[PDB]
């Protein structure tokens, strides 16, 4: 009795930096995020008149 | 003392004791962030900010 045929898959991944998701965001990759609590930055926003 | 002229001592005696030394037990505890243990420890060898 053979054995005619042995196969499998190999999963490959688009990772996040090459897909068009990140047109819409921007990416700043930090060393450790654990460092920082809260992030509360503060901005101080003029209008015209 | 030594001897003579109506002195008699109860001449020299020796003790062998032996003492025990006493275990004591002292306990602390270090916390340490996981942050600082792994930032300043990195595969890649470069220096920091």
Same mark, same amino acid.
């Given at each position: 009795?053979? @054995?005619?045929?042995?196969?499998? &898959?190999?999963?490959?991944?688009?990772?996040?930096?090459?897909?068009?998701?990140? /047109? /819409?965001?921007? &990416?700043?990759?930090?060393?450790? @995020?654990?460092?920082?609590?809260?992030?509360?930055?503060?901005?101080?926003?003029?209008?015209?008149? | 003392?030594?001897?003579?002229?109506?002195?008699?001592?109860? *001449?020299?005696?020796?003790?062998?004791?032996? *003492?025990?030394?006493?275990? #004591? #037990?002292?306990?602390? +505890?270090? +916390?340490?962030?996981?942050?600082?243990? +792994?930032?300043?420890?990195? +595969? *890649?060898?470069?220096?920091?900010?």
């Amino acid at each position: 009795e053979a @054995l005619l045929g042995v196969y499998t &898959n190999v999963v490959e991944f688009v990772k996040f930096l090459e897909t068009a998701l990140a /047109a /819409a965001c921007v &990416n700043t990759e930090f060393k450790d @995020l654990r460092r920082m609590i809260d992030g509360k930055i503060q901005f101080k926003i003029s209008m015209p008149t | 003392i030594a001897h003579g002229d109506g002195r008699r001592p109860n *001449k020299q005696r020796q003790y062998i004791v032996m *003492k025990a030394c006493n275990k #004591h #037990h002292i306990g602390a +505890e270090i +916390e340490l962030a996981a942050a600082d243990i +792994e930032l300043l420890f990195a +595969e *890649k060898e470069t220096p920091l900010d």
